[PDB]
Paper text:
We selected our most stable variants and screened for potent agonists and fusion proteins at the N terminus of the receptor to achieve maximal expression and apparent agonist-bound stability. In close agreement with the design models, a highly signalling-active designed receptor crystallized in an atypical GPCR active-like conformation despite the absence of a bound G protein. While the moderate 3.9 Å resolution prevented the unambiguous assignment of electron density to solvent molecules, the ligand agonist and most side-chain conformations could be readily characterized. While the orientation of TMH6 was unique among GPCR active forms, TMH7 adopted a canonical active-state conformation. We found that the contacts mostly involved the T4 lysozyme (T4L) fusion domain on the extracellular part of the receptor, and to a lesser extent TMH5 and the intracellular loop (ICL) 2. The intracellular tips of TMHs 6 and 7 or ICL3 that strongly determine the active-like conformation of the receptor are not engaged in crystal packing contacts. In particular, the electron density is partially missing for ICL3, suggesting a high level of flexibility. The root mean squared deviation (RMSD) between the experimental structure and the design model was only 1.5 Å over the entire TM region and was reduced to 1.2 Å when the two helical turns of TMH6 contacting Gs were excluded. Nevertheless, with the exception of M953.43 directly affected by the binding of Gs through the movements of the contacting Y2887.53, the conformations of the residues involved in the designed TMH interaction networks agreed with near-atomic accuracy the predicted and experimental structures. Hyd_high, with its high signalling activity and thermostability, represents a new active form in the GPCR family.
G protein-coupled receptors (GPCRs) constitute the largest family of signalling membrane receptors and drug targets. Built on a common seven-transmembrane (7TM) helical scaffold, they sense a wide range of extracellular stimuli (for example, ions, lipids, proteins and small-molecule ligands) to activate distinct intracellular signalling pathways mediated by G proteins and arrestins. Beginning with the adenosine A2A receptor (A2AR) scaffold, we designed membrane receptors with varying signalling activity and thermostability. Here we report the design of 14 membrane receptors that catalyse G protein nucleotide exchange through diverse engineered allosteric pathways mediated by cooperative networks of intraprotein, protein–ligand and –solvent molecule interactions.
Residue numbers in the entry: 1035 to 1131, 1138 to 1149, 5 to 147, 158 to 205, 219 to 303
Write the structure that this text describes.
């Protein structure tokens, strides 16, 4: 409030800023005030090229140059909102959750509907996946090797419902927390959601061998081997989700040492796109889908029944993996747009939240559906109920 007035007087004192300020529109002037307030009149005066684009009323040109700055790479979401305001002369960027004071209030630091749906998913997750584990633990006939993978996926999903989703809610509200404390929480969410994905792929591996190599399934994927695969998945989940803590983070209003706990403010975007999305979601998945497609296309009295059962299994499996991608993709596509196009306006609150909701629904119901379609599971469910 007091610093706002001082920032404007700082602009007036520097001959490199004052003429550029006068040239700006009422709204664009506030964007400059925000920028100066943040890094100082000397810092902003170092933007000789972008200042000349603003002075020449080349708005979109100024946006391009500002988005290439050290400023943008330091705090890209705040820089993006200031840049959008400089380009359009509107508060489009500040539409969710007008004057320079309110702009600074937002940057320094619907929601109820999001939290409600998120907790509804958390509850459903726990109930459904615990039921699945009870069926296998109670009913002796369900304690086979395949169900080691089913139960493993289910258990991970229970932990997602209890911990990960509540933590993900925190991560999107922006309360003031120590930067590294907020980084740890984000990593914990990344580990548990990573585990879901890997567990479903482990299930896919098990089924693939069971339908394509039925003559060696018992003699190839043992209880021991299965436990090994599951352990490996968890090792990878921790390794990946905790990677940011090893150095790949964004921090190498309310108080010193505390920051607004927001996912994108502490977790790097190149990490999420290049490493997490492409290598730990897309390639693993698409490869598995491709395998199923080839088994299906190759496939297409007792020798006949044995084949029809594998053509059906191939279609069912393809549909499951397709659904998985349809729910995980929206979120990662939004992330890609934000990362590849720094000039572009950020996705709106309702859209970002919608994508998160979708991904979390899939992250908890993958095991249950598979189990519900099995006759032995369904009847056992009723007997518990
Ligand atoms: C297996 C990998 N795990 C994941 O994908 C998990 O991470 C989380 N997540 C993956 N991207 C993201 C992501 N961009 N933002 C968030 N929250 C914060 C939402 C948010 C961001 C920016 C703004 C500013 C808007 C503006 O300037 O006008 C507002 C809200 N969580 C993610 C999900 O919970 C998923 O389950």
């Amino acid at each position: 409030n007091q610093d706002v007035d001082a920032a404007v007087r700082g602009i007036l004192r520097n001959a490199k800023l004052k003429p550029v300020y006068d040239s700006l529109d009422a709204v664009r002037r506030a964007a400059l005030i925000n920028m100066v307030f943040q890094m100082g009149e000397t810092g902003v005066a170092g933007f000789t090229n972008s200042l000349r684009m603003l002075q020449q009323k080349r708005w979109d040109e100024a946006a391009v140059n500002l988005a290439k700055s050290r400023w943008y790479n330091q705090t890209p979401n705040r820089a993006k909102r200031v840049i959008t305001t400089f380009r359009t002369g509107t508060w489009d960027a500040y539409k969710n959750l007008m004057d320079i004071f309110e702009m600074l209030r937002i940057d320094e630091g619907g929601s109820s509907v999001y939290i409600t749906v998120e907790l509804a998913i958390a509850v459903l997750a726990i109930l459904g996946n615990v039921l699945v584990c009870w069926a296998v633990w109670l009913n002796s006939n369900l304690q086979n090797v395949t169900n080691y993978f089913v139960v493993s996926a289910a258990a991970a999903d229970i932990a997602v419902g209890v911990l990960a989703i509540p933590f993900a809610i925190t991560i999107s509200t922006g309360f003031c927390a120590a930067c590294h404390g907020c980084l740890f929480i984000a990593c914990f969410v990344l580990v548990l959601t990573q585990s879901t994905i890997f567990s479903m792929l482990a299930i896919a591996i098990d089924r693939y061998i069971a339908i394509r190599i039925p003559l060696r399934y018992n003699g190839l994927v043992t209880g021991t081997r299965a436990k090994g695969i599951i352990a490996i998945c968890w090792v990878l989940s921790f390794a990946i989700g905790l990677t940011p803590m090893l150095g790949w983070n964004n921090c190498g209003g309310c108080g010193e040492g505390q920051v607004a706990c927001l996912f994108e403010d502490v977790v790097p975007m190149n990490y999420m796109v290049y490493f997490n999305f492409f290598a730990c979601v897309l390639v693993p998945l698409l490869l598995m889908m491709g395998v199923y497609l080839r088994i299906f296309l190759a496939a297409r009295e007792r020798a006949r029944s044995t084949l029809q059962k594998e053509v059906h299994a191939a279609k069912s499996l393809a549909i499951y993996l397709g659904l998985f991608l349809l729910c995980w993709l929206p979120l990662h596509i939004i992330n890609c747009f934000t990362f590849f196009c720094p000039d572009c306006s950020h996705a709106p609150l309702w859209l970002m939240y919608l994508a998160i909701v979708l991904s979390h629904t899939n992250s908890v119901v993958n095991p249950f559906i598979y189990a519900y379609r099995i006759r032995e599971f369904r009847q056992t469910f009723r007997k518990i109920i």
